[PDB]
Structure formats: C-alpha cells, structure tokens
Structure 1
Amino acid sequence: DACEQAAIQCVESACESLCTEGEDRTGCYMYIYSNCPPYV
C-alpha cells in the first residue's frame, strides 16, 4: 500500500498522510529508522 511504499522511499513526512493512526504510522517511522540514510 501507499504507507509501506512511503516508508521504503524514506519519506517520513508521508507516513502521516498515507498511514493509519496507531501501529501503521509507528511501523512507517520504525522502518525508516531501521533502514534509511542517515539512520544507517
């Protein structure tokens, strides 16, 4: 879905608009922190 795809592009700002509140949004930030520059 759009949420997952935003996470994989490393665009945190899009987690808010493309992911549901709660777990989905948290999971988008956690992915970014785990796998995107400059976190890696």
Structure 2
Amino acid sequence: DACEQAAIQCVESACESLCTEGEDRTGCYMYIYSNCPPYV
C-alpha cells in the first residue's frame, strides 16, 4: 500500500502516480490539498 503514503510525502504528483483516480486519488490528494503548502 502506498496511495495514502504518497500524500504523506506531501506531493500532489505522488497521489497522481500512485492512486488510480475517482476516490483513490481523491482521499490522498484532498489530504495534500488541505495539508501541504501552498494549500494547507
């Protein structure tokens, strides 16, 4: 497992490469998108 782990790394592209799309990405990407700069 890695999708969520991608978001841990604070890289939008990590979720993109890892997580498929249309939920898998969303959960991951939403984290970064509300945790990582330049979003937070």
Deviation per residue, 1:1-40 (Å, 9 max, x gap): 2111110111111112210221011111100012112222
Q: CA RMSD in A?
A: 1.3
4+ residue runs over 4 A deviation: none
Q: Gaps spanning 5+ residues in structure 2: where?
A: none
Give the structure-2-normalised TM-score.
Answer: 0.72
Aligned to 2:22: 22
Q: Gaps spanning 5+ residues in structure 1: where?
A: none
Give the structure-1-normalised TM-score.
Answer: 0.72
Alignment length (residue pairs): 40
